[PDB]
């Protein structure tokens, strides 16, 4: 159980450090605001008094702060502390941010991989958690068994920005799901329908079926052949006004769902109403 | 196996009529454009020469056309044909549309229930299909065993507009899901990543986990207590710019995902960044 250091003790960094502790690792912790270390000290963490101390304590240095600007602030406070260490940066950012941080790390003698945590904090250490990783394969292979205590490791390749592209794509997908949740639950709550009961009984099973449907849509995207699948855009463009008008009648804003209806309408206006929803991917691409 | 008539032989009405035929019902079919009956004639349907003939053939009359205006056009072509028949109207519409059509039906001597088909055509007759129904319970009970061949029957109550509210809420949820799919797949395709492979391997498992998460969100909505759940809006408002900027870098429009980020930003600006996503429901409500 190799020593690990965690920089960033917010909700997620706390979950990561806690899981290292459960798995028997000497877990050194650092946070910009030191009071946040107290809960972790109480369950066995070693609270580093400085950035340099936290870096010195371990060879595997996990950074889970806020954004890339925050990561660079921490790295630059102790520029010589990182040499011959492996930085695993789990802080949300763009592909470009990962490449920028990697360039800095390599120039300061450190090894670097970037990862994207596909979990909320309570999922860490649980079977459904997964973390995407990218950067030099030999670097990842040196730390993958320690990192595996957090979740399933999904190494996507050598390009250090690639895990971030996968991450942000998955988050995009989730934000659409949550847009749908918000709209659906506002509509039922407008009629005093139990939200949890509706969501467990009706919404989740429907979304499960329509999630499986995404396989067919994705095949159509790859084929660039946008079959209706039995559900043409012409037909959907005549249902969309009903969803909008019913929402207006219930006092529910349509802001979260209007964009896809405008895209569907545009495809109908282009003369392609006989196609299905897989057509919409290319419509938002360059 | 009681005789059934189907009005509307588009993708969905064809699927409904086909399933009645497989289950041994004398299945009478009608379509505004008569050529569309030919595939169903070939597998045993009785093609009605008129609206009145189709109504006369059965006591259970299913209407699956386009919108409420279309339903009223069919009903009004033969106003005396509906007396002492049960109309099951599966044509998409608002709660108000169902109430309007029901008022007409009752004034012309017919029984009426409205339903919302939670299925695409290939799902009809399969275990995952479900149809929502509302209107007089005694009317529904008279036809529920015949209707059960199509999917699971979910009778929601006596108010004839209620199935349509549930339907449009579920469709709203699905359109958010599909917004997420579209954005996520455009981002990976911008980097030449296989769409089907990404969706099957990464997107679907992530959406499955985040769909289960909707139970927690829904409980928080019912409680009007918008705990962060480990994922505060303040934190999400610092990730959202990364998703937007990465999308811009890949040439992908952000139109489908920008609205939820604007709502998150607004909640942070209101001083409620410490809350979680369940807060967004009330934000779009009256
Ligand atoms: N929570 C979640 O569900 C998920 C989070 N993520 C990502 O994980 C990361 C952490 O999220 P989470 O823990 O929830 O966020 P929190 O808001 O709970 O914590 C943010 C952390 O970043 C630190 N930080 C902010 N600015 C700086 C700075 N300039 N220098 C040093 N440290 C700084 C904070 O320190 P201080 O205490 O001093 O403010 C704190 O440790 C983010 O990048 C997030 O996008 C990934 C997946 C899920
Ligand atoms: N397909 C799907 O995935 C789903 C569809 N639905 C709903 O089911 C219904 C049917 O959808 P679907 O079959 O896919 O749509 P289609 O576009 O395939 O068929 C539309 C049907 O409506 C008929 N119609 C349109 N205008 C009129 C009119 N004025 N008078 C009489 N008939 C008319 C068409 O007749 P004609 O051939 O003469 O044009 C045709 O039979 C819609 O309300 C839809 O929202 C529900 C869930 C899923
Ligand atoms: O638009 C509708 C739909 C589209 C795809 C799948 C399921 C339903 C609904 F109005 F028919
Ligand atoms: O914003 C993020 C997130 C929010 C909820 C669930 C999972 C992830 C990510 F940037 F952290």
Author numbering:
A (entry chain A), B (entry chain A): 3 to 288
Please give me the paper's original passages concerning this structure.
The two AdRedAm monomers associate to form a dimer in which reciprocal domain sharing results in the formation of a large active-site cleft between the N-terminal domain of one monomer and the C-terminal domain of its partner. One of them, AdRedAm from Ajellomyces dermatitidis, has been reported to be more stable than AspRedAm and thus perhaps more suitable for process applications.
This structure was again complexed with NADP+ and also with the substrate 2,2-difluoroacetophenone. The F atoms are again positioned 3.2 and 3.3 Å from the O2D atom of the ribose sugar, suggesting again that these inter­actions may be significant in permitting the reduction of the ketone by the cofactor to some extent, but only in the case where F atoms are present. In addition, the ketone 15 presents its re face to the cofactor, which would result in the experimentally observed (S)-alcohol product. The complex illustrates the imperfect binding of the fluorinated ketone 15 for either amine or alcohol production, and also provides a basis for understanding the stereoselectivity of AdRedAm for transformations of substrates in this series.
